[PDB]
Design an enzyme around this catalytic site. Structure first.
Site, PDB file in Angstrom:
ATOM      1  N   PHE A 185       0.876  -1.187   0.000  1.00  0.00           N
ATOM      2  CA  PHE A 185       0.000   0.000   0.000  1.00  0.00           C
ATOM      3  C   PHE A 185       0.888   1.204   0.000  1.00  0.00           C
ATOM      4  O   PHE A 185       1.861   1.275   0.761  1.00  0.00           O
ATOM      5  CB  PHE A 185      -0.981  -0.023   1.183  1.00  0.00           C
ATOM      6  N   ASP A 226      -3.358   9.449   6.637  1.00  0.00           N
ATOM      7  CA  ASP A 226      -4.625   8.827   7.029  1.00  0.00           C
ATOM      8  C   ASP A 226      -5.781   9.804   6.996  1.00  0.00           C
ATOM      9  O   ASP A 226      -5.693  10.996   7.281  1.00  0.00           O
ATOM     10  CB  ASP A 226      -4.509   8.303   8.449  1.00  0.00           C
TER      11      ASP A 226
HETATM   12  N1  LIG Z   1     -13.103   1.465   4.592  1.00  0.00           N
HETATM   13  C1  LIG Z   1     -12.750   2.284   5.773  1.00  0.00           C
HETATM   14  C2  LIG Z   1     -11.591   3.208   5.462  1.00  0.00           C
HETATM   15  C3  LIG Z   1     -10.325   2.499   4.940  1.00  0.00           C
HETATM   16  C4  LIG Z   1      -9.222   3.527   4.619  1.00  0.00           C
HETATM   17  C5  LIG Z   1      -8.003   2.840   4.160  1.00  0.00           C
HETATM   18  O1  LIG Z   1      -7.851   2.323   3.060  1.00  0.00           O
HETATM   19  N2  LIG Z   1      -7.009   2.724   5.034  1.00  0.00           N
HETATM   20  C6  LIG Z   1      -5.735   2.089   4.746  1.00  0.00           C
HETATM   21  C7  LIG Z   1      -4.681   3.219   4.905  1.00  0.00           C
HETATM   22  S1  LIG Z   1      -4.649   4.009   6.581  1.00  0.00           S
HETATM   23  C8  LIG Z   1      -5.451   1.014   5.812  1.00  0.00           C
HETATM   24  O2  LIG Z   1      -6.191   0.811   6.730  1.00  0.00           O
HETATM   25  N3  LIG Z   1      -4.398   0.329   5.732  1.00  0.00           N
HETATM   26  C9  LIG Z   1      -3.980  -0.676   6.598  1.00  0.00           C
HETATM   27  C10 LIG Z   1      -3.048  -1.566   6.198  1.00  0.00           C
HETATM   28  O3  LIG Z   1      -2.456  -2.392   6.878  1.00  0.00           O
HETATM   29  O4  LIG Z   1      -2.773  -1.516   5.056  1.00  0.00           O
HETATM   30  C11 LIG Z   1     -13.922   3.030   6.297  1.00  0.00           C
HETATM   31  O5  LIG Z   1     -14.968   3.090   5.519  1.00  0.00           O
HETATM   32  O6  LIG Z   1     -13.821   3.841   7.318  1.00  0.00           O
HETATM   33 FE   LIG Z   2      -2.420   4.562   7.098  1.00  0.00          FE
END
Ligand SMILES: N[C@@H](CCCC(=O)N[C@@H](CS)C(=O)NCC(=O)O)C(=O)O
Ligand SMILES: [Fe+2]
Length: 329
Positions: free
Chosen positions: A209, A214
């Site tokens: 990723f 965030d």
């Molecule tokens: N669907 C979630 C939001 C998800 C946002 C996202 O994609 N975060 C990544 C980047 S912080 C993550 O959690 N990554 C974690 C990892 O380990 O990759 C909601 O609706 O609130």
């Molecule tokens: Fe993150």
């Protein structure tokens, strides 16, 4: 050649109690970490993370492909037009390794006023069949409330750290309306690991990723004990050590907005690692109409040249932007 990032371990237990002096000393540590790499580990946090890990593993390893379609968000199943956020996020063997389950506030029930109004970013959670996953929904809902509790305590520390009264953020973080989410992410071991599911950074690092800030006020994260996160600092990307006993805490871009970038949202990314592991974030989101007036703790009158932004506006814009930038997860 990739140096360890400074990620202090902060005993947050005073934030649950009534010793104000002790809380100020925790707040100073939060201030320091927030001004340095922007990460710290919360220790003495009171949550049984081993049990969280075990219950999550039981879920991830028993859910079937049939159940994943039945729970899938809209991006994977066009029949589920209401499921933008909550539900199952499928892997794509040969292409996309990660898969996950997201849930929202358990109080978003059919009769909730925001559900009735169809306000964006609010949804009723979807759950697998109870007989196939006994105890999972109950465990997961209680986990929401356990990490909500920890996050409320952390928010008292951030408020004190910024020279505010301890409820400055927490007063906007309420059981009846929080937009906070839990994500139960499975990162698989695969042999062979398809190259199509590996991204490459500019510096040549293999990633799962890409770089991002965030979308949160703060992020309260449990991960397995496999090193993976990196934070961009001035001497480069640095490795954040794993600690599967602690919660990794950082600010999101709403905190950067409110503080006029005094607490930056650190830029970070997820290295590719060929390991079966878990990543379990809690995104601390406020209510849809929560507005905190921006301020600047480096300026004498605290005034900021940023405009107030409601949390709901922030969140819908941010989640959509992050999917466009870094891909549907
Ligand atoms: N669907 C979630 C939001 C998800 C946002 C996202 O994609 N975060 C990544 C980047 S912080 C993550 O959690 N990554 C974690 C990892 O380990 O990759 C909601 O609706 O609130
Ligand atoms: Fe993150």
């Amino acid at each position: 050649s990739v140096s360890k990032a400074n990620v202090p371990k902060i005993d947050v237990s005073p934030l649950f109690g009534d010793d104000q002096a002790a809380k100020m000393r925790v707040a100073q540590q939060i201030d320091a970490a927030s001004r340095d790499t922007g990460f710290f580990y919360a220790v003495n946090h009171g949550i049984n993370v081993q049990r969280l890990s075990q219950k999550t593993k039981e879920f991830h390893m028993s859910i079937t492909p049939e159940e994943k379609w039945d729970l899938a968000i809209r991006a994977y199943n066009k029949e589920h037009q209401d499921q933008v956020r909550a539900g199952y996020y499928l892997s794509i063997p040969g292409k996309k390794a990660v898969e996950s389950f997201c849930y929202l506030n358990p109080n978003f029930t059919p009769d909730h006023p925001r559900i009735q109004a169809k306000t964006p970013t609010h949804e009723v959670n979807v759950w697998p069949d109870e007989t196939k996953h006994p105890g999972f929904q109950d465990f997961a809902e209680q986990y929401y409330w356990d990490v909500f509790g920890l996050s409320s305590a952390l928010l008292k520390g951030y408020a004190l750290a910024l020279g505010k009264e301890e409820n400055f953020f927490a007063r906007h973080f309420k059981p009846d309306d929080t937009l906070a989410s839990v994500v139960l992410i499975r990162y698989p071991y695969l042999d062979p690991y398809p190259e199509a599911a590996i991204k490459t950074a500019a510096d040549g690092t293999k990633l799962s990723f890409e770089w991002h800030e965030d979308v949160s006020l703060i992020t309260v994260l449990y991960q397995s004990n496999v090193q993976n996160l990196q934070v961009e600092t001035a001497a480069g990307y640095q490795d954040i050590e794993a600690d599967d006993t602690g919660y990794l805490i950082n600010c999101g871009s709403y905190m950067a907005h409110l503080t006029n970038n005094y607490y930056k949202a650190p830029i970070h990314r997820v290295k590719w690692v060929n390991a079966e592991r878990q990543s379990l974030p809690f995104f601390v989101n406020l209510g849809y109409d929560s507005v905190i007036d921006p301020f600047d703790p480096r300026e004498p009158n605290g005034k900021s040249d940023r405009e107030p932004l409601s949390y709901g506006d922030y969140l819908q814009n941010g989640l959509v932007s992050l999917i466009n930038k870094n891909g549907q997860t």
